[PDB]
Amino acid sequence: HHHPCCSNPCQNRGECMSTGFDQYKCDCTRTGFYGENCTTPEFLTRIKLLLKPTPNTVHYILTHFKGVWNIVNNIPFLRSLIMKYVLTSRSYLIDSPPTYNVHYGYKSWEAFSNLSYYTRALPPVADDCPTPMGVKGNKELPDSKEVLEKVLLRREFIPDPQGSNMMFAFFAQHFTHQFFKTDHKRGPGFTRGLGHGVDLNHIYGETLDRQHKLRLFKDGKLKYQVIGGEVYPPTVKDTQVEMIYPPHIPENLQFAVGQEVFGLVPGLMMYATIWLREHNRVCDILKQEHPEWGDEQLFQTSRLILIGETIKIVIEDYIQHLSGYHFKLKFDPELLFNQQFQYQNRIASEFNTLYHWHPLLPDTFNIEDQEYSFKQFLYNNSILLEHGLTQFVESFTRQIAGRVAGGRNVPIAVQAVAKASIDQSREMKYQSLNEYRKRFSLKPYTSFEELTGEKEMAAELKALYSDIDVMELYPALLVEKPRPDAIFGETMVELGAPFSLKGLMGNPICSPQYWKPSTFGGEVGFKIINTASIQSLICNNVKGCPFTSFNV
Amino acid sequence: HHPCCSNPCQNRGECMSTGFDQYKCDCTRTGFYGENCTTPEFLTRIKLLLKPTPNTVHYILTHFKGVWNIVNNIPFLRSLIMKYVLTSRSYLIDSPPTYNVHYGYKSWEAFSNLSYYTRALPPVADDCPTPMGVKGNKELPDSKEVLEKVLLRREFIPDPQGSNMMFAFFAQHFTHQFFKTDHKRGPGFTRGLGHGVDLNHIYGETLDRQHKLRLFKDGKLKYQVIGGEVYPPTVKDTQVEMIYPPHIPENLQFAVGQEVFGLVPGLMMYATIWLREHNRVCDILKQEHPEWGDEQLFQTSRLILIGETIKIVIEDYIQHLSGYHFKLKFDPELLFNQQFQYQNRIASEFNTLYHWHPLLPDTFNIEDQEYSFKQFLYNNSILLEHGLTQFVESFTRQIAGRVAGGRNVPIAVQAVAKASIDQSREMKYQSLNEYRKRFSLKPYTSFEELTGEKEMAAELKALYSDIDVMELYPALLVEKPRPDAIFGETMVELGAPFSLKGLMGNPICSPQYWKPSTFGGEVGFKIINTASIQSLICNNVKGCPFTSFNV
Numbered sequence A: 001h002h003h004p005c006c007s008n009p010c011q012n013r014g015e016c017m018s019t020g021f022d023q024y025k026c027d028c029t030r031t032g033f034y035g036e037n038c039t040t041p042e043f044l045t046r047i048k049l050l051l052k053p054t055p056n057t058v059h060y061i062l063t064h065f066k067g068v069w070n071i072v073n074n075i076p077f078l079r080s081l082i083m084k085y086v087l088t089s090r091s092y093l094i095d096s097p098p099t100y101n102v103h104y105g106y107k108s109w110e111a112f113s114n115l116s117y118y119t120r121a122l123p124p125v126a127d128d129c130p131t132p133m134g135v136k137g138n139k140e141l142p143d144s145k146e147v148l149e150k151v152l153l154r155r156e157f158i159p160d161p162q163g164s165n166m167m168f169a170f171f172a173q174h175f176t177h178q179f180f181k182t183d184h185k186r187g188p189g190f191t192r193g194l195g196h197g198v199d200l201n202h203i204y205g206e207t208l209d210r211q212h213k214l215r216l217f218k219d220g221k222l223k224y225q226v227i228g229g230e231v232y233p234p235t236v237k238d239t240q241v242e243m244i245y246p247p248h249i250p251e252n253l254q255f256a257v258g259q260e261v262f263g264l265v266p267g268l269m270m271y272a273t274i275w276l277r278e279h280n281r282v283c284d285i286l287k288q289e290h291p292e293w294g295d296e297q298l299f300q301t302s303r304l305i306l307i308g309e310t311i312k313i314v315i316e317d318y319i320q321h322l323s324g325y326h327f328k329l330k331f332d333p334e335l336l337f338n339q340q341f342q343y344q345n346r347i348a349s350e351f352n353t354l355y356h357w358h359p360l361l362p363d364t365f366n367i368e369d370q371e372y373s374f375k376q377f378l379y380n381n382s383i384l385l386e387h388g389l390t391q392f393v394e395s396f397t398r399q400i401a402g403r404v405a406g407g408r409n410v411p412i413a414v415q416a417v418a419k420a421s422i423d424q425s426r427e428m429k430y431q432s433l434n435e436y437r438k439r440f441s442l443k444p445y446t447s448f449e450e451l452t453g454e455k456e457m458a459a460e461l462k463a464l465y466s467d468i469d470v471m472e473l474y475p476a477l478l479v480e481k482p483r484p485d486a487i488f489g490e491t492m493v494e495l496g497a498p499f500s501l502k503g504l505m506g507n508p509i510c511s512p513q514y515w516k517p518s519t520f521g522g523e524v525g526f527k528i529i530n531t532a533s534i535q536s537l538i539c540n541n542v543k544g545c546p547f548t549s550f551n552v
Numbered sequence B: 001h002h003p004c005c006s007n008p009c010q011n012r013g014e015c016m017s018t019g020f021d022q023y024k025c026d027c028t029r030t031g032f033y034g035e036n037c038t039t040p041e042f043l044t045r046i047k048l049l050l051k052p053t054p055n056t057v058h059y060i061l062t063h064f065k066g067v068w069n070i071v072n073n074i075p076f077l078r079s080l081i082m083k084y085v086l087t088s089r090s091y092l093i094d095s096p097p098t099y100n101v102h103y104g105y106k107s108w109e110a111f112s113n114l115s116y117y118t119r120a121l122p123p124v125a126d127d128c129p130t131p132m133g134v135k136g137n138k139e140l141p142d143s144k145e146v147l148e149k150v151l152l153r154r155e156f157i158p159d160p161q162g163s164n165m166m167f168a169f170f171a172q173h174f175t176h177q178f179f180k181t182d183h184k185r186g187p188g189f190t191r192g193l194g195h196g197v198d199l200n201h202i203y204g205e206t207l208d209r210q211h212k213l214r215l216f217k218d219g220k221l222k223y224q225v226i227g228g229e230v231y232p233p234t235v236k237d238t239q240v241e242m243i244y245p246p247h248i249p250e251n252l253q254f255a256v257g258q259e260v261f262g263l264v265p266g267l268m269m270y271a272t273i274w275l276r277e278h279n280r281v282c283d284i285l286k287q288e289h290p291e292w293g294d295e296q297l298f299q300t301s302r303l304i305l306i307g308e309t310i311k312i313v314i315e316d317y318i319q320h321l322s323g324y325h326f327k328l329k330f331d332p333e334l335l336f337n338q339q340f341q342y343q344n345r346i347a348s349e350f351n352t353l354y355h356w357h358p359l360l361p362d363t364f365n366i367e368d369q370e371y372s373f374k375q376f377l378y379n380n381s382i383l384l385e386h387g388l389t390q391f392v393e394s395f396t397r398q399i400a401g402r403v404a405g406g407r408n409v410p411i412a413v414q415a416v417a418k419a420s421i422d423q424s425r426e427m428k429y430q431s432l433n434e435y436r437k438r439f440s441l442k443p444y445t446s447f448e449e450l451t452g453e454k455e456m457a458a459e460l461k462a463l464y465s466d467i468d469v470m471e472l473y474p475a476l477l478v479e480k481p482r483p484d485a486i487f488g489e490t491m492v493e494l495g496a497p498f499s500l501k502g503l504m505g506n507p508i509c510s511p512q513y514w515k516p517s518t519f520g521g522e523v524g525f526k527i528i529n530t531a532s533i534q535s536l537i538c539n540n541v542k543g544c545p546f547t548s549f550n551v
């Protein structure tokens, strides 16, 4: 006798509970629905469901009428009202305090309190269910190698029509790997990022012992070295900071930074160097305002400013670019001060899964007159030293990235990574694509052709999975029909955006007792946060101040 | 020296050095402006002219009983008053938290390191010219002289509110799940990383300790049976570490979640009662869900007991302490349309004000016996000799001591009281009057105003010389009590906001948790919402003796 909730019977965020070996009950508290399966809508619910516009209608409005948006963007009262709507509309979607995890399909103190887990937006399918997705489909899911090969692997390179470049692609990797840090000794549902958010541990280190080995202990600064007159991160041998390097890397090329894996990719070392310089620049600025401060307060206040700069850039440059909106997004914590909102966050497993954007990667990495293969590029920081940061920024600003949704664009060099995303999803017992769509208030797909918008890939998928209701989440995100001339389809935006909001606005520095000039050393440090940009980050820290952007 | 050492910024303004001898105050959202945030805005003037004082509000809540008997019996009205009670005291606690013993400015280290107690006021900087900043003498008075002159008990002073030994041991048992000072590191550090009501004193702080305490059948905790009665299991059987003198017999080395609870038979009484309650709730959930396994039975029982604890603490424990005629109510739904943060960090000063040593009697009176402190400490054979029924009947009848009002700390624990003074100073606490302003109370203008009498105030005046450098912890024990009450004003107005955040901030009070299905359905939900100190004893103690927190 299998678990009676295995068919996911309760709808509209109702919670399922076994009441016997072969019976269940649904808890409809505060869903706005009632009945055995929480499918009968209450009166006000009927009215609310007739005035709600679709995600695709709202997307259409924000990506047209540029003349009307140019008006709106220059009326501050109107701009804050719309940005307030953008923030609050996606609030109700994330459980906070968090609930489930890979080991707990019911709420428990272990799931609430153990920070080594990723949390879960949907609870896992129970261990004794008759099929992998519950009751639907066949006894085993299709071979992941067949899924990968038929609809995921890149044939010809498909460029992103939104114009994303390699500055964007490496910013994504650098930024997200402060909170996606899987503890593979324990398993794919466990994390080593116990801060669960934007704490900049990828610059300063996750533990105090690592931070102190990275710090200079003069003027608040981080340790550094000088090569050819340029400032780079220090070495492993000088700091005793542990890093992951193949055994053939020379000691002088073993750079030491907050995140142990950033020596793997020269694009990650580019941003690690930029942010190290930015920290020491802000220390210089704070010392001129506060000659009376000691090393500890200079260091700590610089870190808070850089956290604020990160959130500012991610909202007003990074998300702004991804969105495609004509409306100008705004980082303004005061918009939430009269709203109900929880200043806390727990990183969800499914946020990690949807962020596996590996179609972004090009076939070769083009710097100046060179075209490096994957094998030449990995673990080779000599390329950074040979070319320099100015040439990296100028080259990466010009090279187009790949399109993520729309199918068949994962580079063959990382085919094993893509296969692992499928296999670990199943290992963690994820529910199906259509279950996740309902969870985020989207209509379930009725066919594979509806999923993809074409015929050839959908027919491959139909032969593999047979029922659209057992299609898996992660391959679906990469084959989904994209928005018109966009990098993503609907499922990626509507799942990614609420997770992202909580991680940015949930930071304590956005709470009322923190969001004050004195928190950042007075008005001068505050203004650094509120004027930050990807362009100013590069201009202040890269020789020659080259122009840059997240688009080609 | 640091230019902020005089604490110049008022009304919750934040001070920042701007040079070697200059400061600026940040008045953001205080409702005041000006160099020291002392000039009120217009709306602030009107708000300040309607706010009644805490002593006026207390008078209202402890009189007019005929009016409160109507209020208490019309649910719409009762919830309206309780909603005001909760939201009035909200704006006082920083949440997310801010300062700690090592950081007088906000920092990512202070926010993220859970091994610190947080701080409601920042510490006095290390280079200030006097211990309290700039006022007073170069050294505070000798802590032994303060202790002896105004703290030590002469004759036993009973609590006029009628608090008993069931109350006093419940206070000790309950608070020592979240006051767990890490003396390896210092008085500003804690070992309770949950920072609240997680019942680690029953289940253990770590998973390794929890699994050693669990039976792994039917969700239950391990136990032993001595003379037909259920007690906690032994150290030798579970391999769980406890603090015991080496001379304790093997079967009296009880193992429970908190390593120090073998110290007092009164703490083992509650440890035994709560262990029985967990295994009782497992029995109930097993009959409701024959399909459930051991892991889900254990976890659901723990959530149910957390709710029982919060319910009892609000409606029996705080209800007794308050003295109010209005019946407080535990109802998370009252906050669902309010702004409120479901999180908590334990404050050092909350630990400090909770050192209620004067509650302890001169002897512990059980059946026909009167035990001294030396006979009572570490002696669980007393619990077995008399039994739990007799413990409850005796402790319900024995009066506790008055906490405020002076000269009532028993000599047997004089070293604990001294350490509270000394560690206050080590942690660089600001003064009584600074804490009073922080919680919107008028500063005291003389020692006589603080105590309401003459003899203690003159001793204090010769010792401290300036009322503005009087210290927080000794002041709470000499303060003039409310009329016929156990506490004075400072204790209630600092203690109540800390206490609210720790109870209502629990995740089980948030909307996504506060549902029947979280607790195994309606039968488990009802266990929380009907819990009482009387029913806790009635369900788990042979004979169902009557009990109460008052004599």
Ligand code: COH
Pocket: A169, A170, A172, A173, A176, A180, A181, A182, A265, A352, A355, A356, A357, A358, A360, A361, A414, A416, A417, A420
């Ligand atoms: C955000 C976009 C992004 C980019 C540009 C990127 C760029 C690259 C890149 C080229 C520079 C290479 C060779 C890799 C290769 C990897 N990536 Co990514 N990855 C990216 C997103 C991710 C995410 C998200 C994870 C999961 C991180 C984890 O949990 O620690 C990841 C994990 C990995 C892993 C380990 C997980 C596993 O396979 O189980 C490898 C290997 N990768 N990645």
Ligand code: COH
Pocket: B168, B169, B171, B172, B175, B179, B180, B181, B264, B351, B354, B355, B356, B357, B359, B360, B413, B416, B419, B420
């Ligand atoms: C809530 C009231 C209450 C009661 C009835 C009570 C009853 C008793 C009691 C009677 C049998 C004895 C011998 C003690 C003895 C002690 N108590 Co209390 N204590 C109480 C409140 C506290 C608090 C609060 C602390 C600090 C806890 C810590 O941080 O671990 C404490 C700590 C202690 C310590 C540790 C010293 C330190 O510096 O923290 C000793 C010893 N004690 N206590």
Ligand SMILES: CCCCC/C=C\C/C=C\C/C=C\C/C=C\CCCC(=O)O
Pocket: A086, A087, A090, A314, A315, A319, A322, A323, A492, A493, A496, A497, A498, A499, A500, A501, A502, A503, A504
């Ligand atoms: C903390 C994580 C930040 C990185 C996540 C970035 C993108 C997630 C995926 C898709 C989002 C794409 C476009 C954003 C759409 C709307 C903006 C919502 C504003 C907010 O929600 O603020």
Ligand SMILES: CCCCC/C=C\C/C=C\C/C=C\C/C=C\CCCC(=O)O
Pocket: B085, B086, B175, B313, B314, B318, B321, B322, B487, B491, B492, B494, B495, B496, B498, B499, B500, B502, B503
């Ligand atoms: C639910 C909280 C609402 C506050 C109730 C209103 C007034 C409080 C009345 C009396 C409290 C007396 C002293 C406070 C000192 C410590 C807090 C004890 C409760 C706890 O150990 O937590």
Ligand SMILES: CCCCCCCCO[C@@H]1O[C@H](CO)[C@@H](O)[C@H](O)[C@H]1O
Pocket: B148, B149, B152, B153, B154, B455, B456, B459
């Ligand atoms: C309980 C033992 C405390 C006495 C130790 C010496 C402290 C002397 O303290 C004195 O005690 C007198 C007797 O109570 C009081 O009348 C005086 O006001 C006080 O100064």
Ligand SMILES: *[C@@H]1O[C@H](CO)[C@@H](O)[C@H](O)[C@H]1NC(C)=O
Pocket: A207, A208, B113, B115, B116
């Ligand atoms: C917390 O701070 C203490 C005191 O500096 C330090 O010893 C300890 O390592 C810190 N804890 C963490 C998790 O960094």
Ligand SMILES: *[C@@H]1O[C@H](CO)[C@@H](O)[C@H](O)[C@H]1NC(C)=O
Pocket: A375, A376, A377, A380, A382, A383, A386
């Ligand atoms: C590493 O990069 C350098 C460019 O400085 C290049 O000359 C060399 O061939 C590369 N090594 C590998 C293994 O690709």
Ligand SMILES: *[C@@H]1O[C@H](CO)[C@@H](O)[C@H](O)[C@H]1NC(C)=O
Pocket: B006, B008, B034, B035, B036, B038
């Ligand atoms: C502010 O307070 C300081 C005390 O440090 C006092 O000297 C100064 O006069 C005050 N300024 C105003 C405007 O009240």
Ligand SMILES: *[C@@H]1O[C@H](CO)[C@@H](O)[C@H](O)[C@H]1NC(C)=O
Pocket: A114, A115, A116, B206, B207
């Ligand atoms: C969290 O859970 C993991 C897996 O059970 C366990 O190994 C680890 O000890 C737990 N962490 C804590 C702090 O209990």
Ligand SMILES: *[C@@H]1O[C@H](CO)[C@@H](O)[C@H](O)[C@H]1NC(C)=O
Pocket: B374, B375, B376, B379, B381, B382, B383, B385
């Ligand atoms: C412990 O308690 C028992 C009463 O059960 C008493 O007879 C015995 O003398 C006590 N031992 C001490 C050291 O008080």
